[PDB]
Paper text:
The overall structure of the [name] RBCC dimer resembles a dumbbell. The ends of the coiled coil are capped by a B-box 2 domain. The RING domains (residues 63–138) are bound to one side of the coiled coil, close to but not in contact with the B-box 2 (residues 204–243) from the same subunit. Unexpectedly, there was no interpretable electron density for B-box 1 (residues 139–203), indicating that its position relative to the other domains is variable and does not obey the crystallographic symmetry. The T4L is rigidly linked to the RING domain via a continuous fused α-helix consisting of residues 158–162 from T4L (numbered 51–55 in the structure) and residues 56–62 from [name].
A key source of retroelement repression is the family of Krüppel-associated box zinc-finger proteins (KRAB-ZFPs) and [name] ([name], also known as [name] or TIF1β). The conserved N-terminal KRAB domain recruits [name] (9), which serves as a platform for the assembly of a transcriptional silencing complex of repressive chromatin-modifying enzymes including SETDB1, a histone H3K9 methyltransferase, and the nucleosome remodeling and deacetylase (NuRD) complex. Residues 57–413 contain the defining feature of the TRIM family: an RBCC motif consisting of a RING domain, 2 B-box–type zinc fingers, and a coiled-coil domain.
Numbering used by the authors:
A (entry chain B): -111 to 95, 108 to 138, 204 to 406
B (entry chain A): -111 to 95, 111 to 140, 204 to 405
The structure:
């Protein structure tokens, strides 16, 4: 079976149905819009208060489509925020591919992060690539018993790693109207608009020069004419042959090429009296051939389209990588320039260190000899000032004089300072503007 | 009026003696060297074990001069370590002058950091610059009754902030030999070498003569140039030394010929016809001359110590110059790298601009492509639904008119990739010749 599907915003659109009026689930909580949980209390006024909290105006329990989809985007983004914020389901969230992360966001949006935080052992089996055990363990839960359809679909999407389980449903819902999503079996008269959507006779809205003749499709809001809509002749059984319009109880069996209208016997002899004709078998086979050719071509063009689409996604990834490339290579190049400059500076300080260690060594030696001179001079001075004691110290003149005569000094070569670096900062303020940003060309 | 000291940490050399043999402390402990406390136990063999552990060689309980002074420097550096390590006496250490700091180091050397950390009440008085209170409170400490001499000297140096209290001792010790620190009385016979140091007759080296090395400054002199210290007969007793060759008649005459105090027998022989000089007249004259010489030397010494201080200032200035050079180089390098980082940020900003523009274009194009893909999937799902054999032919018009809608993948230019394009060759060359270092 041939399946066609989108990605992840769609899936929340397929699982839940859009209702702009406040509604109670047959067994659940008061919700509104597209699966927006207002409150869990039974009181309607509480639900309306939470409604006005979400909208900001008094609505009286009725919303509009744009506001419902704004709340939808808010709810989905908040669910993913509550996923990445929670510390117990994030490590298992990171290791999954887009599709399973996708399914998990759906599960959290339906039951809440705390609701899915209870399913410990199924998550422990899912993180480690043990799929089937997780599926069967997930089947036994209240979430499965309340809404078994959605639960089975989400479990299947976890199992397969593809959106096919919803693609199949997209095809199934193709037999249901796009408004109230009821089965278009002919009780309510089905209608098929030129946009190839199907609806009920009551789900068309309202439905004097001009009263109608113009109608907006309820799902895609593409304008078409009231005459171009035909009853969905496809929902007829599960007889095949339809009876003629003007000719009651008289089946159609000829195809008029003049009027291009499938016709009845009496019609193509009276009305289409001189028109062309084809026996139904040959014309039906012909048109089936043509439409099969068109669908093959459309499938080919769509395949090439999505291939080019993913190539463009790859191209945006690559432009972001190019941006990182340029920025980090510039940072590292300038860092290398500053590194070679710091190396030059560290080698330069060594020269000041050498000259200063030399001069300081000479002056330190000079200071040492000067301290020795000072000390032994003080000694001579005390011993000579010891002439105060009245005595016949004449017998000690020779030692006291000739040693008092000890006068000496030293000397070192006076040197100049080297404190200026003498950098030409003008050259560097000019050289700062030497920035090249080439291109691939 | 004789303050001459002008030193820094010889004060420990003046307070504590030098002993190459083990000696018993004033406290009764086993000590050696220059006030190095080995242990407080009475047993000597423990003292010899700690000594050989500290010295490193087999000593047999006796050390030499240079290694003892090695231990002196070692102990002083360890005392300063124990000062800067302790958190009770470091804040009080910083607020002191160099001299008062030397005094604190002396106290730590004598009693230990834990010993001086106990005088908390008095220590806090030092950092508040209340000197007299600190002096009086320290004067009544256990340390004062134990070793009152060193305590009085250190307390005077703390009170005054000068080395005067040690200059006095420096002059007092002038009457003691520089070796065994005994009082130079008539016994223990003093001798005065030409280097103007004084020693005992026994402290001039043990068993080649007529040449002898001074025991304290190790200056070579002759065993004949040494004269007995004629200056120290204050004790007891009239007191004139007798002639050299004539062992019985004293020298009372002064010859102007030889400038030598002479005896009368020597006047009969040698200075037979010389000019002589009266007693007082010669002594007063030579006293005048030597006073003039000491004036000259004192002035020269004052200017000398001034030059010494100034030279220390110059060696500080060269270190300040070194710090200046290194920090100015660092700051210049940082400043250029700052403006370089700024230019880099502006270039990255331009790259961000171009890339975000291209990204917006490709994102909206991808959105329209997703729209097309979904609309095509819808048409295809409804058309591939022709499998049910039926009168779908009564629906031809709708299936074809919408099936024929094929449209508009709407392209854009692939933008060239942006590389770097720097010139590190030329720029590392210009980086390698930035330095001047002019004088
Ligand atoms: Zn409906
Ligand atoms: Zn439509
Ligand atoms: Zn008819
Ligand atoms: Zn016709
Ligand atoms: Zn002696
Ligand atoms: Zn000497
Ligand atoms: Zn004479
Ligand atoms: Zn004589």
């Amino acid at each position: 079976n041939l399946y066609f599907q989108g990605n992840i915003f769609e899936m929340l659109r397929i699982d839940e149905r859009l209702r702009l009026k406040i509604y109670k689930d047959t067994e659940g909580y008061y919700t509104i819009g597209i699966g927006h949980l207002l409150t869990k209390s039974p009181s309607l006024n509480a639900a309306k208060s939470e409604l006005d909290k979400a909208i900001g105006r008094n609505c009286n329990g009725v919303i509009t489509k744009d506001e419902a989809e704004k709340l939808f985007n808010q709810d989905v983004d908040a669910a993913v925020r509550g996923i990445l914020r929670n510390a117990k389901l994030k490590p298992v969230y990171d290791s999954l591919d887009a599709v399973r992360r996708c399914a998990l966001i759906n599960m959290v949006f339906q039951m809440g992060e705390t609701g899915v935080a209870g399913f410990t052992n199924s998550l422990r089996m899912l993180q480690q690539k043990r799929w089937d055990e997780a599926a069967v363990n997930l089947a036994k839960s209240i979430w499965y018993n309340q809404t078994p359809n959605r639960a089975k679909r989400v479990i299947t999407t976890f199992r397969t790693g593809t959106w096919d389980a919803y693609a199949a449903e997209a095809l199934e819902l193709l037999e249901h109207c796009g408004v109230c999503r009821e089965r278009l079996r002919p009780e309510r008269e089905p209608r098929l608009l030129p946009c190839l959507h199907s609806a009920c006779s009551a789900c068309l809205g309202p439905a004097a020069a001009g009263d109608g003749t113009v109608v907006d499709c309820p799902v895609c809001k593409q304008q078409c004419f009231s005459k171009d809509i035909v009853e969905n002749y496809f929902m007829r059984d599960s007889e095949r042959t339809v009876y003629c319009n003007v000719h009651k109880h008289e089946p159609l069996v000829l195809f008029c090429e003049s009027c291009d209208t499938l016709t009845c016997r009496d019609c193509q002899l009276n009305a289409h009296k001189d028109h062309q004709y084809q026996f139904l078998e040959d014309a039906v086979r012909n048109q089936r051939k043509l439409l099969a050719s068109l669908v093959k071509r459309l499938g080919d063009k769509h395949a090439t389209l999505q291939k080019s689409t993913k190539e463009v996604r790859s191209s945006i990834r690559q432009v972001s990588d190019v941006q990182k490339r340029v920025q980090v290579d510039v940072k590292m190049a300038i860092l290398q320039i500053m590194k070679e400059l710091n190396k030059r500076g560290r080698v330069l300080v060594n020269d000041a260190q050498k000259v200063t260690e030399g001069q300081q060594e000479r002056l330190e030696r000079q200071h040492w000899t000067m301290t020795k001179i000072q000390k032994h001079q003080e000694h001579i001075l005390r011993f000579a000032s010891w002439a105060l004691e009245s005595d016949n110290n004449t017998a000690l003149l020779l030692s006291k004089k000739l040693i008092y005569f000890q006068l000496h000094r030293a000397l070192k070569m006076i040197v100049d300072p080297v404190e200026p670096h003498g950098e030409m900062k003008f050259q560097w303020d000019l050289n700062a503007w030497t920035k090249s940003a080439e291109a691939f060309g």
